[PDB]
Each structure stands twice: as C-alpha cells, then as structure tokens.
Structure 1
Amino acid sequence: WTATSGSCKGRCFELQEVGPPDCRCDNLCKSYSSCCHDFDELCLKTARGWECTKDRCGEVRNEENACHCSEDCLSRGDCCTNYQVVCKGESHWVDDDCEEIKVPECPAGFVRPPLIIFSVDGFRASYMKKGSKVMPNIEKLRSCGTHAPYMRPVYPTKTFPNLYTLATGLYPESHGIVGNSMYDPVFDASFHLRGREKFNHRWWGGQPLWITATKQGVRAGTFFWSVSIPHERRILTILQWLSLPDNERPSVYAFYSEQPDFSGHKYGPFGPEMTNPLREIDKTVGQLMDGLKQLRLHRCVNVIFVGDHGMEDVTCDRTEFLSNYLTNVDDITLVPGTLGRIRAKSINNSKYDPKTIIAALTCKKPDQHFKPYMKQHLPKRLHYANNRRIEDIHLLVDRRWHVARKPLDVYKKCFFQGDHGFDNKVNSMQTVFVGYGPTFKYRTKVPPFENIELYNVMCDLLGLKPAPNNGTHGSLNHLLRTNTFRPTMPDEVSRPNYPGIMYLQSEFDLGCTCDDKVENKLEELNKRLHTKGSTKERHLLYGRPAVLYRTSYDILYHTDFESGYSEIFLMPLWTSYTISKQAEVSSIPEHLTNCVRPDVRVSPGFSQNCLAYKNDKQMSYGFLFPPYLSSSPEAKYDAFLVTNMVPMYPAFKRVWAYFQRVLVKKYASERNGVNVISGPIFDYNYDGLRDTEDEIKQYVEGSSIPVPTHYYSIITSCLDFTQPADKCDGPLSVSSFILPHRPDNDESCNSSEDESKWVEELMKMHTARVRDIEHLTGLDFYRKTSRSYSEILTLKTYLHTYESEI
C-alpha cells in the first residue's frame, strides 16, 4: 500500500527515498507505483518544451514552464540548457575548440570534481566511428578526452548483468545478476524484466558505487530513472542537483538512456532507422554539456560515457530448436535466446539426466549453431559458473543465432532484427568508453579493457576505497592525469627450496624405465652449472613467479627450462622456458619413447610413479617442458624427468602435443622468440580460484597424483617484435590460454581431423588473461621486469581475443 496523499511540493527529485506507505518524489517513484498525487504536476512540467527561444529571453518567471529563460534562471539553477546560447550570445559547448583541462576549474565550495556517468544501453563500439558524423558532442568528448577503441562487457552480454557489473566491479557469478531472467533454487523465486521479484534486494549482491559512496560520506545522486521520465527532464534534474548548496549536493550522478538498444532490437545494429536514435543521444549529451558550461562546471566535472553491451544481427529464422534434438523436450525448462540455460522442469523427475541431454545436443548437425557445455567446462575467461542461479547445462550460442525450446515459443510468444547476449569476446558485443574531464588525460587513446575495471576508477575519481571486487586496481592508471592508485606487489608467502643431488637411482621404486645408460670434465662441469641455474636468465625472463599461499616447493634448474615443483601436488606449479626464433624442433627419439627418469634432487616419496599410469587405463601423461624443443640430444634427457611429467588424458595429449610440437615454434617464428610458462590448474569447485589440496576430486588411480582440471600457458614476447624475446628493451606482449583437461574432445566437432584443423580453434576459445591464471594458481607473474607496475597490471589484464579489427 501507498497512501499517495502526501505532497511532492518542495520535494521534486528528492535523493532520500522515503519508506512506505509515505509517497515518494524521487526519480524511481513511478517504477514502484509510489509517487505522490501531484508528482506529475509539480515535478514533470513540460510546458513550452525544452529550449529557450528569442521571444522567451528575460521573460517573467512562470513556474509552470519545463525550464526557464528568465534573468533569475541561472541563480535558481533551472534555465533551459540552451539559455546562454539563445539569450546571452554564448556558443554551444560542441562549437568551442577543445582546450586541455590541466586542473579542475570548479566554483567555490566544490570539495572534489563531480562525476557524471552517462550510460547508454546497447551502444555498440563501432558506432563511435560509424556514427561520428551525426554525433558531434560525443565525437568531441571522444577525441578531446581519453577513449578506448572499445570496451569489453561481461558475459552474458545482457543489460542487467552488465549494468550491475559496472556499478560493482564484480563478475555476474559474484554479484548474482547472472541473466535478465533467473531462477534461484534456494529462494525458489524467479527474477524477470517484467515483475515485482526483481525489486527485492536479495537478488543484488556486492556493493554498488552509490552504496560505497554513501557509506563513506560522499553523497550520491539516485542512478536510475523511471522509464517515462523524458531524457530532457533527467538532464535538467542533474543540472538542478549540481546547483544545490555544498552540504546537499551529490558528488556522483548517473544519466541512463534506453537507446540505442531499444531501436537496435527492432532494426538491427546498422539498420537505416538507427541514425535518428544516435542523433537523439548526441543532442542529449549536448544539453548536458551546454548546461554544465552555463553553470561553469564544464571544466570541473569528470564525465564517463559508457555502454553496457553492443548489438548483433539476429532474426527469427536463425533459431535452433531443442525439439529437433531431444525426445524428452517437455521434461526441461530452457532459458532461451542468445544463450541457453537448461534445467529439469520438475525436481521430482528422477529420470532427468544431464549426461544424456548433453550427448543429444553434441555435434548432431553439420552447421549446428550452438554448443552445449556443463557450466564448469565453459571457457574460464567467462567466469560464468560459481552461482547456484547458473544452471548446470549451458548453451553457448553462435553470434547471429538464437536457441529456443520449440517453434511455437518463437511465432506464438518476426519483429526483431537485433539482439545481444553472446560470448563477450564477439566483436559485435563490444561497447564504448570515453572519459572526459580534469582527472582524465587529454586526447589519449588507451587500449581496450573490460568493464569490471571501471568501478575501481570511479572510486578513485571520488576518493573512495573500493569494496572487494574483480577489477585489478591500477591496471587502468594510464587513463588518468591524477588520482592514480599505486598498488604494491603482493608479498611472496612461500619461499622455495633449491635442492642439489640428494638421492641415488636405486632409491626410486617408481616402475619407470629409460634407455639413458649410454654415456668428460669439459661438459660435465658445464651441465652441473646448468643444474645450478647457469642458463636461468635466458629461460626465466621476468623473474620467478611468487607463490602467494603456504606450501612446500622446489626450484629446479635445467639447460632448457626452469620449474617450481610442488611436493604437495607432485608436479610443477610452473615451468618456464624461452624458445628463440631460430630454435629447431626435433623428435622424441625411439630409445626414449617410453623413457621416464627419476630426479635425483627430489625424494621418491615426493615423486610421481609410472606404475600408477600403467594401471590407470584412462590416464596417460605428458610433459610441461616439451621434449621436441630440447637444445641438444644431451639436453633432451632433462625433459623426460619424472618432475617434468603431468597426468594427461589421451584425448588431451593430442591437443597438448600439437601445441608443443607445432604451435610454440610457430609463435616463436612470428613473435621473434617467446617465453613460455606452463602449468597445471585445479578448480574442481569452479570458483575461479586455486583449489586447496583437500578440494581435489580426482587422482591418477591408486596414487596421490591429483589430476588437473586445466592446463595453462603464458606466452610472452617483445611488443616491438624486431627485438628478440630474451633481449627486449621496452613493453611486453602476451597471450595466454587455460585449456580444460578433458578425457574426450567432444567440444571440438572436427576433432577426428588432423590437429591442424581444430586444435588452434580450441585454444582460441580458451584464451585467457594472465590475471585469470593468477586467481587459479595463487601465483604472481612478471615480478622482475624493467616496466612500471601499473603497466604490468595492464599486461596482466590483457586478453588476446583473435577477433579481427573492430
């Protein structure tokens, strides 16, 4: 109930939302069906429209008017935004040359530059350039401020997940808004765009910017606007709040536009009808900036112009139907569209089996335009698994397509030409970022980055301490003139042992064999030097990764590679080696095919054993440093050490061997040498974080050899590729992957073909940020470079996406 009997007189667009049943006068009251009876009359005036005219200049104040053209209007703070242009011979903000804002130029009583977030729904990255002709205010912000060529949204690329990621710096799996539609099995409640459940606070996790601000004594505007409030009124209301006395004035504001998304759905991202929506958004930006200039705030406020996701061509006829694959279609509930989430229609149906569903949706049609996954097998870069609101079964849909349950869902439930929601590395899903103001840099282009990072920066812009979040604070310091955050490297927690030769061959009862018995102070002193780390500066180029949790591990040096070998997990945490552009690939020799050699530095009791592999009929093994890339026949023996071995399913070995034999050398040819760091990952609870020893669900049969869920590699080279990776003067270039360690290649429909037709495609899908590998391993890389730490933080958040140019 709401006793809407109170009055909004003197309360229009109040910031403090008042409690039931007292009627509300804030920008969300309409949405809660809760506004006082006179809210429209007093708060949403429209008379005479939104622009001053010559005949209105110096008029007598008429309180009925939407905005004012009278002489008192500037002090009152309620002029039309074009008032000084029409009445005082001033220029529009867009028509002024840009001039660098070296310091804030704010009126007295401003304690810090305000922040205004201007968020546009469905604003595809390529609109900045393709629409630049019809967007002159936006184009001036972009070209005069700091911009990225694009900004990467989170998966799924839908409105609510992304708008709440912007506000919190969290992945959807962490903030809990995992789609526009959700079922929470614990609450037994459903969340939908239309309905009352979405208003319930229990859905919304983490700590959004407005709560962060409020809790730290920084006043916030109310971020969101009921759909019926026209954009011109939203702008005028922001400009009003900015004219409030110092003790009442908010320090952060948001404007939100439903466009161009709304038109994009109807017309496609580039439908000819899309020009007018882009003009309209630009006019709105122009009104803000003229209004700011009027208040002498246009060289004082920081403005972020930011989108939530882009828009793709999607029509009705490009729909896959689950009824075409499954006999049992009415036994499931599907959350459909540009992603699929499947669960049992009924909890009482014990004939429901996810395995049989996955199988029936796996590579069944030539051009099948979706791919099923259990959620833990989704690419780790998506960070889309650790929430009970995300169903176990997921359909990753091809761009341009939809999945649906049955044809009747699609013609009896076409209109649309655009949609979004797809994999967040798809070029059409990319969105925009522009920062303009005293705190941002001047005419600066910054590389693409992810929207998870912005929360930290908005906290920085406001002098707030950010809540714990998934950004990497400092990785966007290069966007900023001032207010940078100077993080320090985490302290290493465990220090390594450096074991020498401590064990005789006969102490090992591992069931391994090696034709290595075939046998000089020249090279014998030389190879002892190699075991002491004499070639380490070649193979460990950025220092050793720091271990950020308590554990017991050994650094092992070899001619061709260095490693940090875990005595707990019985295998390396990391293996680091450099391959020059001129390195040669050799074969595994015949007499070494099945060779595994004990490592005299590491006890039997801390080693793997070959018997365990012989007796495990599902498990084989691979090597982290590839034997194919030994520097010499003699050095090749090091690669067959039991301490270089890791468990690998035969299906996975096909992937790994092709990577090691073919791709590494190829990368070295293309990048002028590469430094590779490889290693296992264990994430049995799919939370994106390194498992402790007690969390491992699977071991090599009869042993304590834990089976990795994933294998990573971090491949680093010189950004300036005319310098060799090992002698690089400047910035680095990286790409990385996290490959799921799976006993089949069902993910790859083409896998019965030669690896050259499917392995690289698999690896591209499982591309990763170094930061992702860090969360998953508790390692910190790039500890010793010549580079600034913020620059290394940026490198660590880099994702190599393999998409062609935006």
Structure 2
Amino acid sequence: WTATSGSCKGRCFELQEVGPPDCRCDNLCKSYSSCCHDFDELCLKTARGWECTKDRCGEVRNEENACHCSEDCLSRGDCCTNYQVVCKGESHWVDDDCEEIKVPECPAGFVRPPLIIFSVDGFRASYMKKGSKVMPNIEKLRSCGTHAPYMRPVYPTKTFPNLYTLATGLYPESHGIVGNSMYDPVFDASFHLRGREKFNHRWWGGQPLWITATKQGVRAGTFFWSVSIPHERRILTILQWLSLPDNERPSVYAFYSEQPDFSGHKYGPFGPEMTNPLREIDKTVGQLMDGLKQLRLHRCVNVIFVGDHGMEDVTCDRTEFLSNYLTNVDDITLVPGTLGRIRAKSINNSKYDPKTIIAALTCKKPDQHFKPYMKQHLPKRLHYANNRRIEDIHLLVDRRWHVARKPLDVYKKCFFQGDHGFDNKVNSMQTVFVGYGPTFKYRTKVPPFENIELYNVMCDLLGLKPAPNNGTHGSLNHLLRTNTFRPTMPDEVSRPNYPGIMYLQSEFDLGCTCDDKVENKLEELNKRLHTKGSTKERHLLYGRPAVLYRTSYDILYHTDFESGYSEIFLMPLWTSYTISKQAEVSSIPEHLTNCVRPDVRVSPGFSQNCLAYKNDKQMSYGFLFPPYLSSSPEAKYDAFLVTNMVPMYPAFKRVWAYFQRVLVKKYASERNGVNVISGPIFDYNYDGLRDTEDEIKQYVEGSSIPVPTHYYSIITSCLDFTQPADKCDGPLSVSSFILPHRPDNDESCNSSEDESKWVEELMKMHTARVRDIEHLTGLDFYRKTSRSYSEILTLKTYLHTYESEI
C-alpha cells in the first residue's frame, strides 16, 4: 500500500528514496506503482517536444513546456539540448573537430570529472563499423576517445547477468544473477522478468558501483529508469542533476537504452528495420553531448558507451525439442531458449536421475544443435557453476538455435528473428566499448577485453576503492591517460627446496621398472650441470612461477625441463619447457614403453608408485614433459622419472598424447618456438579456485595420489614471430587451455575417429586465460620479464577465442 496523496511539487526525480507510505517521485516510482498522483503532470511534461525552434528563442518561461528556450534556461539548468545551437549561433558537438582533452576543463566547484555510463541493450560489436554512416555522434566518441574492436560479455549473454556484471565486476555465479530467469531452492523462490520478486534485494549479491560510490562519499544518480520514461526525458534529467549545487550534485550517472535489443529481437541483427533504432540512439547521444557542451561540461565528463551483449539470427524453425530425446519429458523443468538448464519437476520424485537424462541427450542426432553438460564440466572460462541457482544439468546451445521442452511451448507460450544468450566467445554476442573524456586516452584503440574488468576502471575514474571482484586491477591501465592504479606483484608465500641426490635406488619400493641399466667425465660433468640448472634459462623464460599459498615443494632441474614438484600432492604443480621451431619429435623407444624411474632427489615417501596404477583398473598415467620431445636419447630417461608422472584416464590419454606428440611441435613451428608450462588442476567444488588437500574427492586406488579434475597448459612465444620464443625482445603472445580430466570422451561426438579429427576442437572449446589458471592453482606466472607489470596483467587476461575476424 502507498497512500499516493502527496505531491511531486519541487521533488521531480528526487535522489533520496522516500519510504512507504509517502508517495514517490524518483525515476523508478512507475515500476513500483508508487508515484504521487501529480508525477505525470509535473515530472513528465511533454508540451512542445524536445527541441528549440527559432520562434521559441527568448520566449517567456512557460513551466508547462517539456524543456525551455527562454533566456533563463541555462542558469535554471533546463534548456532543450539544442538551445544554444538554434538560439545562440553555436555548433552541434558532432560538428566540432575533436581536440585532445589533456586536462579536465570543469566549472568551479567540480571536485572530480563526473562519469556518465551510456549503456545500450543488444548493441552488437559490428554495429560500430556496419552502422557507422547513420551514427555520427557515436562514431565521433569512438574515433576521438579510447575504443576496443569489441568487448566480451559474460555467460550467459543475457541482459540482467551482463548489466549486473558491468555494475559489480563479478561473474554471474558470484553476483547471483545467473540468468534472466532463476529458481533459488534455499529461498524456495523464483526470479522472473515480469513480476515483483526480481525487486527483492536477496537476489542481488556483491556490491554495485552506485553502492561502492555511496559508501565512499561519492554521490550517485539513481541508475535505473522506468521503461515508459522517454529517452529525451532521461537525458534532460541527468543534465538537470548536473546543474544541482556542488554539495547535492551526483558524480556518477547511468543512462540506459532498450534499443537496439528490442528491434533486434523482432527483425534480426541486420534487418532493414534496424537502421532507424541505430539513428535514434545516435540522436540521443547527440542530445547528451550538446547538453554537456551547453553546460561547459563536454571537456570535463568521462562518458562510457557500453553494450551488454550482441544479437544473433535465431528463428522458431531452429528449435530442438527435448521431447525428441527424452521419454520422461514431464518429469523435468527446463529453462529454455539460447541456453538450457534442467532440474526435476518434483523433489518428491526419487526416480529422477541426472545421468540418464544426460545420456539420452548425448550425441543422439548427427547435426544435434546443443550439447549437455553437468555444470562442473562446462569450460572453465565460462565460470558458470558455483551457484545453487545454476542447475546441475546445462545445455550449451549452438549459435542460431533454441532448445525447448516440447513443440507446444513454442506455439502456445514466428514472432522473433533475433536472440542472444549463447557462449560468450561467439562473435555475434560481442558488444561495444568506447571511453571518451579527460581521463581516457586520445584517439587510442585498445585490444578486446572482458566486461568484468570495467568495474575497477569505473572505480578508478571516480577515485573509489573497488570492492573485491573478478577483474584484474591494472589490466586496463592502458585505457587511461591518468588515474592509473599501480598494482604490485603478490609476494611468494612458499619458497622451494632445491634437493640434491639424497636416496639410493634400493630405498624405493614403488613397483616401477625401467630398462635403463646401460652405461666418461666428458658427458658426466655435463649431466651434473643439467641437474643443477645449467639450461634453466632456456626452459624457464619468465622466471619460476610464485607459489601463493603455504605448501612444501621442490624445484627439479633437467636438461629439457624444470619442475616445481609438490611433496603434498605427489606431482608437479608446474612443468616448464621450451620447444624451438627446429625441435624434433621422436618416438618412445620400444624398450622404454613402460619405463618409470625413481627420482633419487625425492624420498620414497613423497613419491607416487607404479603398483597403485597397476591395481587401479580405471586410472592410467601420463607425463607432464613429453618423452616425444626429448633433446637426445640420454635426456629422454629424465622424462620417465616418477616425479614427471601424473594420473590420467586412458580416455584422456588420447587427448594428452595428441597434444604432446602432434600439437606442441605444430605450435613451435607456427609461432617460432614455444615455451610450455603444464600442470594439474584440482577443483572438486567447482568454485574456480585451487582445492586444498582436504577437498579432493578422488585418489588413485589404494594411495594418496590425488586425481586432477583438469590439466592446463600455458603456451607463450614472441608477439613478433620473427624472433624465436627464447630470444624475444618485446611483448609476448600467449594461448592457454584447461582440459577437463574425464574418464570418457562423451563430450566429443567424433571421438571414435582419429585424434586429428576431434582433439584440437576439444582444446579450442577449453581455451582459458592465464588468470583462470592462476586462480585454479594459487600460482603467479610471468614474474621475471622485461615487460611492465600492467602489460603482463593484460597478457594474463588475454583469451585466445578461435573465432574468425569480427
């Protein structure tokens, strides 16, 4: 109940929220059905439209007008945005040459350049090029300010998850808005688009920019606008707030456009009907920049023009029906469309089985346009698992398709020709970023980056300390002229041991054998040099990774590779080796097929044993540094040390063997040498973070050998591929992956074929940032390079996506 009998007289678009039952006058009252009776009359004037005309100049102030062309309007803060153009001979902002903004040029009383966030729903990245003719205001911001070719959204590439990711710097799994539609089993409550539950605070985790600002004494405009408030009125309101007295004036503002998403759903991303919504957005931008110029703020305010996600061609005839796969179709609840999430219709049903649902959905039709995953098996780069609101069963839908439960859902729920929500590496889902103002750089293009990074930068723009988030603070410093945040490397927590030869062969009882008993100070001084690190500058190019947690581990040197060996997990945390373009691949000699060798530097008690592998009928083993890439027959023996071994399912060994035998050499050939860092990952609670030893759910049978959930590699070379990886003078180039360590290859529908038909496609799907691997391992890489730390942070956030040119 609201006793809506008060008045908005003098309170239009008030910044403090009045509590029930007094009536409201803020930009959200409509959406709560809580505005005072006179809100429309006083606060939503429309008379005479939004533009001054010649005849209105110098007019006598008529307070009924939507905006004003009277002489007093500049000082009252409420001229039409084109007032000075029509009545005072001025030019439109878009018509002025751009001139570098070297310092903020603000009116007296401004303590800091304000930030305006201009957010556009469904603004696909290629609109910047393809629509450039009809968007001159936006094209000016883009070419005069700082821009990226595109910005990567978060998964799912839906509206609320992405807007709230922009506001918080957090993955949806952490902020809690995990889709446009959700069920929370703990609340026993549902979040929907239409309806009131979505207004309850309990859905919204983390700490959005407006709250960060408020707690630190920086005032915020209210970010959200009722849909029926027209764009012109939104702009006029922001401009009025900017004329408030110093003590009352917010420093951060948000504008939101429902376009072009709204039309894109109806007409497809490039429908001929899309030109007009793009014109109209541009016109709104022009109105803002003209209004800023009138207020002498166009060289003071930082403006961010940012999208939430793109838009793909999607139609009713491209829908897959779960009723074509499942017999039990009425025992499930599906969240449908461009992604799928499945749960049981009823908790009172114990005949519900996720494993049989998954099997019934796996590789059932030749051209099948979705793939089922248990959420913990989704690509780690999606970070889409660690929330009770994300259903255990997930379907990744092919770009251009929908999944639905039954055909009746699609005709009794074609209309739409566009949609979004697909995998966040899909080109059609990419969106835009432009920054313009004194704090951004002048005429600068920066590489594509992820929307999770923006919250830190928005904090930097406003002098705020960001709340803990998933951005990597400093990785976007290269967007900024000043206000950079100067990050430092984290301190190493554990220092390694450097064990020498400490054990005799016969102290080991590991059940391992090797045919290695074949026998010269020329070559014997040499191998001692190798074991003390004589070739370490070749194989460890960026310094050893730092261990950022308390643990016990040993550095182990070898001719061809160096490792950080964990006495706790009984295997390396990392193995580092360099493969030059000229390197040669060899086979495992016949006599050495099953060879495993005790490491005389490492105690029996801190070693794996071969017997456990013999007895564990499911589990086999592989090696981190591959025997195939040994520099010589004698160096090959090192690759068979028990300290280079790691547990692998035979099914996974097919993937791993192909990567090590075929793909490493191919990368070295194409990139002019590569440095490789590989290792295990343990993330049994699927939280994106390194497991402690007490979290491991699986061991090699009869042993303390923990089974990794994933294996990673980080493959680095010189960005200037004319320089070899081991002699690079400048910036680096990286690609990485986090392969799920699975007992089957059900994920790959073509896995019955030769590895050359399916393995690389699997690896591509599991591409990762170095930063994702850092979180999963508690390691910190690239500690010793010639590069600046901010540049290294940018490199660590890089994702190699394998999509073609945008």
Task: Please give the range of the TM-score, normalised by the shorter of the 2 chains.
Answer: over 0.9
Q: Is the aligned partner of 1:303 residue 2:308?
A: no
In the TM superposition, residue 721 of structure 1 has moved relative to its aligned partner by 0.3
Q: Report what 1:283 is aligned to.
A: 283
Shift of 1:691: 0.1
SS in 2 for 1:221: coil
- The separation in 1 between residues aligned to 2:231 and 2:23, in whole angstroms, is 23
Alpha-carbon distance between aligned partners in 2 of 1:422 and 1:697, rounded to the nearest angstrom = 31
Q: List gaps (5 residues or longer) in structure 1.
A: none
Q: CA deviation at 1:273?
A: 0.2
What whole-Å deviation, never above 9, does each CA across 1:605-661 have from its counterpart, x for those lacking one?
000000000000000000000000000000000000000000000000000000000
Q: Deviations over 1:661-683 (max 9, x none)?
A: 00000000000000000000000
CA distance in 1, matches of 2:706, 2:713: 19
1:215-269 CA-to-partner distances (Å, cap 9, x unmatched) read: 0000000001000000000000000000000000000000000000000000000
Q: CA deviation at 1:340?
A: 0.1
The Cα of 1:357 is off from its aligned counterpart by: 0.3
- Match in the other structure for 1:484: 484
Deviations 1:439-474 (A, max 9, x none): 000000000000000000000000000000000000
Q: What CA distance in whole angstroms lies between the structure 2 residues aligned with 1:447 and 1:729?
A: 21
Deviation track 1:60-119 (CA, whole Å, cap 9, x = no partner) reads 000000000000000001000000000000000000000000000000000000000000
Q: Aligned partners of 2:697 and 2:84: how far apart in 1?
A: 70
Asked if 1:559 is matched to 2:596, the reply is: no
User: 1:757 Cα shift?
Assistant: 0.5
Q: Distance in 2 between matches of 1:636 and 1:20?
A: 77
Cα deviation code 1:740-770 (max 9, x no counterpart): 0000000000000000000000000000000
Structure 1 outlier segments of 4+, above 2 Å: none
What residue number does 2:31 align with? Answer: 31
Once structures 1 and 2 are overlaid, which stretch shifts more, 462-471 or 17-26?
Answer: 17-26
**Who is 2:103 aligned against?**
103
Deviation string, structure 1 residues 142-161 (Cα, Å, up to 9, x no partner):
00000000000000000000
Post-superposition Cα deviations, 1:324-382, rounded to whole Å, max 9, x if no partner, equal 00000000000000000000000000000000000000000000000000000000000
Shift of 1:476: 0.1
Deviation at 1:22?
1.0
Q: Distance in 1 between matches of 2:192 and 2:636?
A: 60
Identity of aligned residues (%): 100
Render the CA deviation track for 1:304-323: whole Å, top value 9, x for unaligned: 00000000000000000000
Query: What secondary structure is seen at the aligned counterpart in 2 of 1:744?
Result: coil
Question: How far is 1:698 from its partner?
Answer: 0.2
Q: C-alpha distance in 1, partners of 2:145/2:487?
A: 25
| Separation in 1, partners of 2:34, 2:483 | 40
1:12 is displaced (CA, Å) by 0.2
> CA offsets per residue over residues 275-301 of structure 1, 9 Å max, x none?
000000000000000000000000000
Q: Provide the aligned length of Structure 1 versus Structure 2.
A: 806
Q: How much does 1:505 deviate?
A: 0.2
SS at the partner of 1:160?
Answer: helix
Instruction: Give how far 1:21 is off.
Output: 1.1
**Residue equivalent to 1:219:** 219
The equivalent residue for 1:763 is: 763
CA deviations over 1:500-521 (Å, ceiling 9, x no partner): 0000000000000000001110
Q: 2:720 aligns to what? A: 720
Distance 2:582 2:600 in 1: 32
1:520 & 1:223 partners in 2: Cα distance?
77
Corresponding residue number in structure 1 for 2:252:
252
Distance 2:730 2:222 in 1: 45
Counterpart for residue 681 of structure 2? 681
Secondary structure in structure 2 of the residue aligned to 1:460: helix
**DSSP 3-state at the match of 1:662:** helix
Q: CA deviation at 1:427?
A: 0.3
1:642 is paired with a residue of what secondary structure? coil
Measure the CA separation in 1 of the matches of 2:120 and 2:40: 25
1:160 paired residue number: 160
1:712-741 CA distance string (max 9 Å, x none) = 000000000000000000000000000000
Listed as ranges, the matches of 1:693-704 within 5 Å are 693-704=693-704
Quote the Cα distance in structure 1 between the aligned partners of 2:33 and 2:749: 52
Residue deviations 1:181-238, cap 9 Å, x none? Answer: 0000000000000011000000000000000000000000000100000000000000
Q: Partners of 1:743 and 1:588 in 2: how far apart? A: 24
Structure 2 counterpart SS, 1:371: strand
Deviation at 1:565, TM superposition (A): 0.2
CA distance in 1, matches of 2:230, 2:779: 50
Query: Could you report, residue by residue, the CA deviation over 1:466-485 in whole angstroms, capped at 9, with x for unpaired residues?
Result: 00000000000000000001
Equivalent-residue separation in structure 2 for 1:584 and 1:359 (angstroms): 42
What do residues 489-533 of structure 1 show as CA deviations (whole Å, max 9, x unaligned)? 000000000000000000000000000001110010000000000
Partners of 1:7 and 1:656 lie apart in 2 by 71
| Cα offset, 1:417, TM superposition | 0.2
Provide the C-alpha distance between the structure 2 equivalents of 1:489 and 1:32, rounded to a whole number of angstroms.
47
CA RMSD across the alignment:
0.3
Instruction: For residue 280 of structure 2, give the secondary structure of its aligned residue in structure 1.
Output: helix
Which TM-score applies when normalising by structure 2?
A: 1.00
d(CA) in 2 for partners of 1:217, 1:78: 27
CA distance in 2, matches of 1:519, 1:89: 94
Equivalent residue, structure 1, for 2:201: 201
Alpha-carbon distance in structure 2 between the residues aligned to 1:601 and 1:74? 80
Rounded Cα–Cα distance in structure 2 between residues aligned with 1:408 and 1:137: 45
Shift in Å, 1:134: 0.2
Between the aligned partners of 1:426 and 1:746, the Cα distance in structure 2 is 23
| 1:429-444 matched pairs, under 5 angstroms | 429-444=429-444
Q: Give the SS at the match of 2:259.
A: strand
Name the SS of the counterpart of 1:394 in structure 2.
strand
**Deviation of residue 567 (structure 1)?**
0.3
Matched residues in 2 for 1:530 and 1:204: separation? 56
Deviates more, 1:16-25 or 1:56-65: 16-25
Q: Distance in 2 between matches of 1:504 and 1:33?
A: 82
Distance in 2 separating the partners of 1:378 and 1:25: 45
Once residues 628 and 646 of structure 2 are traced to their aligned partners in structure 1, the CA distance between those partners, rounded to angstroms, is 16
Structure 2 SS opposite 1:738: strand
Aligned residue number for residue 395 of structure 1: 395
Aligned counterparts of 1:518 and 1:747: Cα–Cα separation in 2: 44
- 2:209 and 2:519 map into 1 onto residues whose CA distance is 68
Distance in 1 (CA, whole Å) between partners of 2:694 and 2:777 is 15
CA separation in 2, counterparts of 1:210 and 1:411? 41
CA distance in 1, matches of 2:48, 2:159: 34
Structure 2 CA distance, aligned partners of 1:427 and 1:269? 12
Residues in 2 aligned to 1:544 and 1:24: alpha-carbon distance in whole angstroms = 60
Correspondence for 1:614: 614
Indicate the residue corresponding to 1:515 in structure 2. 515
Provide the secondary structure at the position in 2 that maps to 1:776.
helix
3-state SS, counterpart of residue 523 of structure 1: helix
Aligned-partner Cα distance in 2 for 1:490–1:400: 43
Counterpart position of 1:210: 210
User: C-alpha deviations, 1:389-411, integer Å up to 9, x for none?
Assistant: 00000000000000000000001
SS of equivalent to 2:330:
helix
Quote the residue 2:177 is aligned against: 177
Q: Distance in 1 between matches of 2:508 and 2:775?
A: 35
Q: Distance in 2 between matches of 1:757 and 1:426?
A: 22
- Give the Å deviation of 1:166: 0.2
Rounded to whole Å, the distance in 2 between the matches of 1:34 and 1:473 is 40
Query: How far, CA to CA, are the matches of 2:18 and 2:596 in structure 1?
Result: 72
Deviations 1:772-801 (A, max 9, x none): 000000000000000000000000000000
Q: Aligned partners of 2:2 and 2:562: how far apart in 1?
A: 70
Stretch deviating more after TM superposition (14-23 or 251-260): 14-23
- Measured in 2, the distance between the counterparts of 1:331 and 1:519 equals 68
